[PDB]
Amino acid sequence: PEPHAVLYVTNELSHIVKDGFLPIWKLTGDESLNDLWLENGKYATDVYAYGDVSKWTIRQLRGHGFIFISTHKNVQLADIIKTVDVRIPREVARSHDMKAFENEIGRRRIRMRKGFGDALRNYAFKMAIEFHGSEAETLNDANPRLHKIYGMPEIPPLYMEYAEIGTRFDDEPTDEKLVSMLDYIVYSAEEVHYIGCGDLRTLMQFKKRSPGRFRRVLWHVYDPIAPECSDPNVIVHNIMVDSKKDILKHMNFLKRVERLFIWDVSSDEWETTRFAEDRLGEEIAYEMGGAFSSALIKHRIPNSKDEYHCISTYLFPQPGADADMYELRNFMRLRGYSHVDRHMHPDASVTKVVSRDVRKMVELYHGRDRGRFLKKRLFEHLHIVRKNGLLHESDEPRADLFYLTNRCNMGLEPSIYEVMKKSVIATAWVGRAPLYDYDDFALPRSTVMLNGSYRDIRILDGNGAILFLMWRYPDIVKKDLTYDPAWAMNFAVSLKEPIPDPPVPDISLCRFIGLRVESSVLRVRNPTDLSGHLYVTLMSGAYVTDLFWWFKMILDWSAQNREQKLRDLKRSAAEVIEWVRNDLIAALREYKRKMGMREGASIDSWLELLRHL
Ligand SMILES: Nc1nc2[nH]cnc2c(=O)[nH]1
Numbered sequence: 001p002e003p004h005a006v007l008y009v010t011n012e013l014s015h016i017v018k019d020g021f022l023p024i025w026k027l028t029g030d031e032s033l034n035d036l037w038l039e040n041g042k043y044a045t046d047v048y049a050y051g052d053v054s055k056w057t058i059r060q061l062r063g064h065g066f067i068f069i070s071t072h073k074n075v076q077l078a079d080i081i082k083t084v085d086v087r088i089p090r091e092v093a094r095s096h097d098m099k100a101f102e103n104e105i106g107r108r109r110i111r112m113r114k115g116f117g118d119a120l121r122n123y124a125f126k127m128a129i130e131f132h133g134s135e136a137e138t139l140n141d142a143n144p145r146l147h148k149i150y151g152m153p154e155i156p157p158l159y160m161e162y163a164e165i166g167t168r169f170d171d172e173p174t175d176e177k178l179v180s181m182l183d184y185i186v187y188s189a190e191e192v193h194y195i196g197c198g199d200l201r202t203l204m205q206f207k208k209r210s211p212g213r214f215r216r217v218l219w220h221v222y223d224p225i226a227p228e229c230s231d232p233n234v235i236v237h238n239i240m241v242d243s244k245k246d247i248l249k250h251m252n253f254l255k256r257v258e259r260l261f262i263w264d265v266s267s268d269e270w271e272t273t274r275f276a277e278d279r280l281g282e283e284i285a286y287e288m289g290g291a292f293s294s295a296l297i298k299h300r301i302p303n304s305k306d307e308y309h310c311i312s313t314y315l316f317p318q319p320g321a322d323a324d325m326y327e328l329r330n331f332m333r334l335r336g337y338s339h340v341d342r343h344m345h346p347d348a349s350v351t352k353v354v355s356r357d358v359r360k361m362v363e364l365y366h367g368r369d370r371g372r373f374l375k376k377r378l379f380e381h382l383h384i385v386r387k388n389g390l391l392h393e394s395d396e397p398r399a400d401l402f403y404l405t406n407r408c409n410m411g412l413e414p415s416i417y418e419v420m421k422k423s424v425i426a427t428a429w430v431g432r433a434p435l436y437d438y439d440d441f442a443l444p445r446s447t448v449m450l451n452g453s454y455r456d457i458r459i460l461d462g463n464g465a466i467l468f469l470m471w472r473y474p475d476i477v478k479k480d481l482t483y484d485p486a487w488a489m490n491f492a493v494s495l496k497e498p499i500p501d502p503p504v505p506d507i508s509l510c511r512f513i514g515l516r517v518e519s520s521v522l523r524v525r526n527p528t529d530l531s532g533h534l535y536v537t538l539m540s541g542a543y544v545t546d547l548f549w550w551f552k553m554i555l556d557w558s559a560q561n562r563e564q565k566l567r568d569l570k571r572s573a574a575e576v577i578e579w580v581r582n583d584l585i586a587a588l589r590e591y592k593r594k595m596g597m598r599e600g601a602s603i604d605s606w607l608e609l610l611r612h613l
């Protein structure tokens with residue numbers, strides 16, 4: 001809505017910037033601290049800035065809005081030697097196109113979005129178990145035997161009771177059928193009896209792309225034609241399978257384990273053998289249902305039969321599989337130990353299927369050049385627990401990232417705060433620009449600031465949030481981390497995180513970039529300094545800081561003295577950018593003088609927490 005970034009470039013770039021349409025900020029390594037803060041605050045959009053910044057730490061620079069573009073790998077600071085956020089290729093200076101240069105920034109900026117949500121997420125996996133509004137990404141980095149991953153994924157093309165299909169959605173190519181299979185089914189298994197594994201090329205390429213989960217899992221594999229695979233998490237079996245006893249003897253029963261049954265069995269005049277193969281793969285899974293957690297039975301569709309039967313939880317189309325591949329994979333969820341509770345997905349039963357409706361599924365969703373987006377949906381739907389965030393009442397501690405402010409939740413505002421009163425970590429869209437690849441809606445920043453802050457609950461904007469994590473848990477959140485602060489500043493973030501002792505004015509907390517331009521607009525438009533300053537912050541909705549702590553920082557902390565208060569900075573390894581209650585109490589008042597109803601309680605809460613402290 002207001003928040004910008006300083007697109008910082010290194011010397012050799014500068015000349016081309018001049019030729020742009022955005023404001024340029026020039027340095028000049030002196031510049032006091034309180035110099036940057038007043039200048040940077042003049043820029044109501046993104047800026048370009050160059051020249052010497054040796055004096056300064058990174059935190060200092062990110063709180064200011066910095067993104068480090070250059071041709072060189074890194075740039076020298078006072079803190080450390082930072083990895084440039086945005087490297088430019090030589091040739092694409094160089095050239096000296098302002099446009100290809102400006103485009104080049106954009107892309108990496110959208111790529112930078114990732115790193116931001118990787119820090120918050122990567123902290124959540126540190127402090128939590130339950131998990132809400134999740135997706136493949138969160139599955140991807142989860143520990144399936146600890147974190148418990150809920151959410152509401154977008155349900156794929158399915159056949160059971162039960163039809164509905166389609167409709168079609170846009171999609172792109174992926175990994176060939178057989179490794180694109182493994183990819184979505186393998187997640188929480190611990191042991192896999194892979195029946196009919198062929199020559200193993202399949203599973204090896206699975207290793208070659210997805211190495212972690214290949215090793216975090218155990219593979220019995222079965223074929224007349226399977227070679228000796230030197231791997232030690234691979235016990236091979238040449239034995240062909242007619243009975244469930246050719247698997248059974250090869251499971252340790254004295255210990256609990258999630259086990260997965262994968263069937264893929266084909267041989268060599270009609271073929272109602274193709275049939276009683278699949279049907280067998282099913283019966284064998286079934287008899288064992290109670291030792292496996294689930295199964296992916298192969299399921300090709302016959303010509304002869306218009307309708308037929310099978311045991312099924314689901315039947316679905318196959319990513320990366322050719323268009324003419326007339327073969328669905330049949331899921332069976334089962335009973336048997338599993339670190340993911342799937343009792344939503346119905347207990348695999350007998351299923352009447354109509355060939356032509358399967359025939360249609362293949363027709364709609366198969367294609368070499370389709371699957372990517374299907375596979376995802378399958379993955380989630382299979383392994384996420386279908387549970388609604390604002391409604392789930394949890395016993396364990398719980399994280400709430402990047403779903404909260406979704407357009408489907410619109411109106412249900414109260415429930416939202418309820419979640420941010422008690423989550424470990426959660427985030428709300430508060431950005432007021434156009435604003436794309438993002439389908440969220442904004443919460444009023446004042447209302448966030450005021451409802452957000454509780455003793456335990458620290459309420460910062462994404463950048464503050466990050467700065468904080470850098471500063472408190474330096475190795476949950478690295479310092480060299482690349483991210484785009486502007487974007488970080490579209491999110492309100494909340495953490496179950498105690499106030500510092502002593503409540504130092506760290507950047508995580510105190511930035512207030514542009515608060516002077518912010519105070520003037522305020523006064524030409526809707527007109528009514530630590531008294532007025534608090535009011536500005538609120539009325540602007542430019543800002544999201546932790547009211548509570550910042551309160552505590554003012555009264556309980558300043559005074560203290562000159563000597564005795566920096567000192568307690570050293571120490572708390574804090575850092576700043578800027579070198580009584582009766583103000584604040586009116587600050588509040590004035591605020592709600594202008595805002596009956598559109599708020600604020602609460603307010604009342606805040607006042608009555610000064611008038612008692
Ligand atoms: N910054 C950011 N990172 C993510 N990682 C997964 N989803 C998101 C998102 O919406 N934003």
Ligand SMILES: Nc1nc2[nH]cnc2c(=O)[nH]1
Nearest residue numbers: 136140183184375376379
């Ligand atoms: N099946 C699958 N789909 C994904 N979509 C994004 N990441 C993954 C992954 O690891 N596996």
